[model samples]
Target: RVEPQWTEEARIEGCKPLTPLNMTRSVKEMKMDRAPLGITRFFKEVGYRVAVKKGSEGTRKNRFVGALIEPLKRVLERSHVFGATTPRAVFNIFRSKVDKAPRELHDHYPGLKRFYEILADLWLKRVGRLRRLSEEEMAAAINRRGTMGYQMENRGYTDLGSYWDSGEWRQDVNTFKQSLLAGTPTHAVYNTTAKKRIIQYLPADARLYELRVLGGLHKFLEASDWSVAGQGLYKYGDRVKKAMNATGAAIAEDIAGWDTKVSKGLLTLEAHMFCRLAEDAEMEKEIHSLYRLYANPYMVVQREIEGEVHDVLLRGRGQVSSGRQPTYAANTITNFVTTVYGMARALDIPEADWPELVRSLTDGSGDRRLLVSGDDKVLFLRGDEARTYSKKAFRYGNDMGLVRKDMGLEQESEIITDVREISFCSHQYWPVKYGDEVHYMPVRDVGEIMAKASMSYRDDTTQEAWARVQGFNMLVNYHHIPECRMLALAILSATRVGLNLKGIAKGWMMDTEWLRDDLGPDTIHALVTDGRTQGWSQLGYVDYSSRKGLLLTPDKQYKHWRRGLKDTINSLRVEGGNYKDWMNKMAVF
Candidate 1:
């Protein structure tokens, strides 16, 4: 038997070619000698021999030099040839140290001054401009109050019309809808009308679509025709049928059965809205659309993929809050990986060949045979032959297992395994746990609580109550918040009062000690001791009582301490402090 010929057309149409994962070089091979010429030249100019050594093998002097150079290395790595600020910040830090040097060490000061000039030259070469955002400018930008102030102020208000009239609802709806359409990730805003602030993931487009269908603008029952109903059925019919079959609500064996199943699903979805909205027809219609859209597995998958891509991009960019330049090169790799995996699942492109398809989509130099158009249309081009499809419809078709069936492509169990593995890999960088609803807590609230509560270091009891309250708020509100957002908020909050993690931890710990009577020893133990241990363990740090053990260095110790303190505070908030059993079993552990 002869193997099938893999021509250019076949490769483009079937996405047969694979772009294998790029392997990284061994750490030992990645030495300072192989670093950029400019960097190595700077070291030489400073009369410093840059050495690379394993952490365990490095001598005290070597470690000291490494630590001393680490900040500069980081600045260089994060700086761009364009305008960059971090190098200037690092320069200022070094300058301040030099300024405080003893007069007797005046001889050494000239060498240090020369070193600074060399460093400045190196920085100027790497970063053309030494322009950095002033502290006041950064503070202003961070604290530039947008809709957050409105959301906070109106939290207790029950009037839904007020929120709508204030344009908050419209803004949220547009933001939610556009993000979905563009396949970007965005935060779900708090529902002010709800008993508790329920963060809504539902987009307003779904609600409007439902209203249009209900008002006879679109015929809802005409699933066979190429209309709105037909499009909706094409996208969601399989999902509805499967759901109904799983619940033993219907047997969807034929087209008629599928129609019935989908109709029933829609009705059930609307019924939930009725119950939720309760006599408020306007609100019912509004909320119902969200529920209806969420009920569709296609939209859910789209959101999930979008979220994964967002996280991949976020991680690739690294800690921007720490003044790191966006890693464009790393981003390209991550973007390709994430989008390929997502698209493979979206288009049901066989596991054997998706990398090439992704490459074609991302790499500008590719043949450009397959494309996702700006208007969210997928175009397949093979020589003169061209086919266009709505991207959402195509993705939905693939998700419903229709693409392979229509293409006469045989499915394999390994494909399922590969997809699951891909999903797991995507989630590894930013593991998220989603709930039915999220609670909203403003950054202003957290900062205010921290400021007032942390003032009295001597008074422990009051601080403990404050800590518990803060923890409770964080537990409820911040579980679904992104790490980047959390870091940004932390940075912003720190700027307010010269606050640091250590001070916050110390204050909280003191508070916990004072509340030993009110909160009980067991609760305090869970909050302080167990929380700290678990936090440190999460960071792979083992605490040592004796100095003989491999103790964490000052920097590592600071990080570990912060992590432990955060966990300790978080302990009070987990389980909502509602159930004793849950608190004991889950929260403590």
Candidate 2:
């Protein structure tokens, strides 16, 4: 629980070897007496208020729950701030929003966003205590309402006033608070002005650790020993295991049989490489040893080349076209997330645009297009033109697989796949999928296919016929992180889960869409200073204009938009192997 820091040596070390840098408060910062914050606040507040209102009117006397509410509320509040100032809250809110309309694990990316009035907030602030309880009583009272739904008795809140109000509730709750607040270790990246973020490494035995986290492979995160693994109902571990067995070749017992060494907890959204490369290791030799996971597995050969990495960078490009190709794109993505903080800075995404992003990346495109295919009935084909991707879903049947079918969709107009699935470092198919799951990933050929295809061809294939297959290979490969060179992106991935629990709540989160339409001005002002702010122009990616034109309208934000493309690619990786499923119809095939 001690505060984290780095000495001058660490900072210098981070700069020479490490890289990148750094969100939020609204209203006051905007100099408005009536500042504008969104309805996100109202969701928590009113939701809490409603839970309290529908709470146990009978046991409303429980001081333990009462005593605990404010602290928890206070903490949750501070956790939701984003974009402009105060990032502590941004991570969770970002996670929630992303998780909100996110595609199934097997599906692909979604970039949904929208602004709403802070009506939810105003309403929540106006919420009143139920009359069944006196205002004084409400002030100090806490009601545990949902407990009984599980048949844990009448449920919700133990009326300890009658039972000397046992301190047990308070004790357990505070204990949890202490642990929850004790953040996992993180470090500062020197690349983009030294942005600081969290970092947790896989135990040495947890070779599956990084993949588990990135993939949301809950079962693995829990089974593997990365600290907070097996805790509670969210046994993200259980979710992961269940997800694996449901869609993957992994067996039920195999998922269940994995051991757990802890009670319950959530993993952070950062990568372990940050910890090992910047915070944990000390000696230069140790750094070298750890390079097994840190370096783009494919780039290690140049170490034997007796020159610096970039020196030998293009050296391998030749003939690499005939072999397994690693293009500038891999490094392209790394630069953006690491250097530009793309994900963290994407607070301005619009709702309409968001879902389309998701749809394009995840599911809707399967049945909507036909410019891709190689197999007649397979979801992923070798030639061009489309068919019912669902028809191809059957291709994934136990014949095992020749292609990875479960990887979800992506943000590009075309499908995309990470290099990790078919990658090698030190001449080995790295971080290969654990267990006997990848039945059809012509592993060697996959690596070769990925390498041989033109950069544009592979990029196009991922957006086309070969996408889902490639994505499946990448998503299912639990040990591919060390091979993918996605270590930085995975770590930089600030994630959260959002659930449309309208059905669960008798239409709560669903009603929210209608209820929260009045979020006031998005008065949040942010300044992104860039010397290279104009760099995208030379990259040949950005094209926009002040005046709309037929052929050459220039885009002011195209540079950032192009940078965004890479961010989406980096975000695609699964860490600590904690994956759930593909985005859309996850393996209904």
Candidate 3:
């Protein structure tokens, strides 16, 4: 059993109460003597010691398991680095701490970081070398390059000994001895002394071509195109946005306008407009174009710091919501699927009742939220009973095959229902079953109810309901990165057996509780940078303090916390008199 509440020492001022899972480490155990200088030496010594331990004990198989020990230790010791750590916690510790470290000691930090990266790599390939995979199987595994599993496996050094022995590791050591060195150029942001951190966007098609590196994170990164889609995930949205613009929908401008309203506090979070604009001839052409080749699938791009690459599978348009194309098509298709099944339930109809003539899109929302254009409300159903036609899981090429025996009616049609399920741009209800209640989501009614309700903290009331729902939606855009936009499709494509760290990380960040108060973007920025001298405040979404709807107070030094592990042990060794002061400074959540 675990304790229910946080200890008083950790329940300090400004910090919210924490559940039992959150731990408070004692900073007194930090070696003041080693504070600035000893950390590098400590890691150097530990690395060599661990290396010897591995050398003394096992075969490649056993050594593979050994790799697990170090990463586990590293994660625990590095907890304080994140205000509230989640798997998505991949902020740059080096940028926060070592960027300002003494020039001479730079080598030590990279050396330590590199050591762990090696460990992670070793763990990935351990199974391949085990007695488990036969010779032919090993070759097949290696051949699965560009795939998620293989890409993850190939991320680090080939083997533990290979890492230490290779000229590559030695070259890194020599480079570090040069006391750290490092860039700028084309596809870069303009100079700004406004204390802003700006990243330049690579070509939109960078995912398609390997000619150039995407960003600083990919400098030495060798990655597999792990995207499950046949191509870049964002390509779908980009194409859709382009067509919407060409057709006069101007989707981006509309979204930006919506954002401006939210920033001004003129509207609550529920105030999003569904795109049901009137269409012209060009719009009809674009809509038809979407049907021709709209399945813009992309791979996950299995990432490795510096290693071989793997293949990312193709996840079709199964994941709905995002980009103009996906939103339109996925919503149409998913809605039709939902409506057909729902209508089927509502009228208690079945596949035998499906249109023998293959008529479609009788009911519509705009091209933005619905599937059809022109006039005449189209539906997959006939009468007032608006239940869905079929509950079978949707498929891309053969949607009608599963529920209907009408092989002769093979045509697939786009049907836009409500914003009930296909929503990735922000928060929109999918479907949820509540025990005996099954599901009774009246999306439009709920949206109206929320728009009318005030924001509040009280539980179960309308305001509370709105806040909770809005609170979650606010997290949907936790950062301004394009990945947040790309995740919906990637996640749906993962197939439950792949490593989607980027998508997973983004999801966790959105799921993190970083704010308690609701306010406009500017006000939130004001608080994030308010009193702290720490430069982290300048970063908008990346910095925890600036994150919207967060529950815990942001700790300025959180980024530097992990570096302490390069020197200090995790034992509880704080001196008695100084413990309270130290804990307040370091241990509070």
Candidate 4:
């Protein structure tokens, strides 16, 4: 049997002490080469059992505090509506005055009044008063849609075209504004069918006001006192339990119908009311130019390679000219290591413990092990197979895939092994060699190691094994050796060059169909329309229209609106931008 030799020089040079004598031999070796032994005889005896137990108890206590108190504090700080009050009491008050409009409700309730006053002030500061369109102007705009305008008017408001000619359209806009100021339920602004038509024909200023009002009401509901009451009651009180059970039962009774109503109503409303305003205002091109603000940042590019379709989801700008992808890749690598370090610290394992912990894990026997030589090279040992990576190879700018080959342990040949052997060879098991012994440690066992070292582990057994493997490699390669770190950076820079070259090549042969698929018909329509509307030299007005739809619940929309309002306020504060910019920024994919 081949055994590694540990020299006096290695110990003097600050290497960890050798493994104990009993742990040096395997059960198979003991049986065949020495003396027959029981199956469990080769088990590594841990001397830190007492320390592990204490660490486990400490972990549980910390988790209890995190699970119980942290969320409670967050809720109280953000919602501001709970503590002494209950949602049921607030709901009861709302129900009693349900017939009253927002203005009337404000008169009766101090909280409601405060909410309205603040929201109204915000609207005045941000958007100014709503503007009205003349009857002649409305007639001319409606005429631009040709016969479709007449069809739409008839479909919803009977004689809407006639209403415009008769000066009633102006009357309706005034009434709509009054209704909003009076706190009328938005659903009551127009009859259900007519509401859809109102948004399409309303002037830009009116549309802006309607959106703000809807968004503000949604925001108010989200942070209202009821939210605090709901969370607190759900956590601590029996009355809330009973109320929730009853609510669940009611929902379950007509779940299918309720689901149908919610999905159809919300989807249609968002499509007509929210998504179509840019098209109506002739600002579709400006909106498309700001795709980074609203559109999904990822695009799946598909190509036919040898008669098989290959799809690649590209992120950032998804174009060769955009130099953002490589930066994103580097940031991701940096974040991966930092996140692992943060998690370890949270578990009570300090940054100082990492070097020692890494060394200890590498000292056990395993199929795969990492050896950091004194010369700053990393030797990847896979059973009897070995591969080496040097700082020089990285400095010369090698392909990331070449480095990834040994790092990922992709075997070129097929082999069969026992489950235990497979587990040991798995990426989750990050082993290392130190002095004369190979210490194999499953990434899942990291917390246990922390426990053995008299530190805490999160009580939940959920493990981030893959993260540890990658993170440890980064720590040893980038954090420990300055030359190795510089080499890694050079390799990453080479990766960026390769990415840009491939992007340029792909961009040249890119299929228009693929681009359409990536951006979707609506986005393309918006871009084309905007190009013409903005009087771009090569383009002319070409109408390509489609109804936009949203698949979301009222609850989710409320949350989105609240978040959106906050973002708008922030953007306004920082950039001095307007509501037009705010509208372009809000919404989901």
Model 3 lDDT at residue 66: 18
- For model 3, how many clashes? 52
Tens-digit lDDT track of model 3 for 296-385: 111111111223222111111111112221222223222233323333333444444333111221212122111221111123232122
Error of 1 at 202 (Å): 13
Tens-digit per-residue lDDT, 1-589, candidate 1: 1222121111112111221111111111111122221211001111111321111111121121122122223222232111111222322332232111111111222222222233223323333322223333322222111123222333664433234345455455455544433333233221111111111222222222223222321121121111112221112222222222222221101111111112212223223422232234554443343332232111000001212210000000000011001112112222222223333444455654543443334332232322111111112222211121123223432322223222323222111111111111001011121222111111122222222222211323223333333333333223222221222222222221211323333321312232221232233224323333322112111123211112112344334433443333333332433322222222222
lDDT of candidate 2 over 135-161, digit per residue (tens): 233223222211211111233444323
- How far in Å is the alpha carbon of 329 misplaced in model 2? 18
Alpha carbon lDDT of each predicted model: 0.24, 0.20, 0.21, 0.23
Tell me, by lDDT, which candidate is best: 1
Model 4 clashing residue pairs (backbone): 81-225, 102-183, 362-432, 362-439, 363-438, 363-439, 364-438, 364-439, 364-440
**Backbone clash count for every predicted candidate, in the order shown:** 0, 106, 52, 9
lDDT of 2 at 467: 28
**Model 1 TM-score (2 dp):** 0.19
Residue runs of model 3 more than 4 Å from their true location after superposition: 1-278, 296-307, 311-329, 336-338, 341-589
Error of 1 at 333 (Å): 31
Worst 10 residues of 4 by lDDT: 250-259
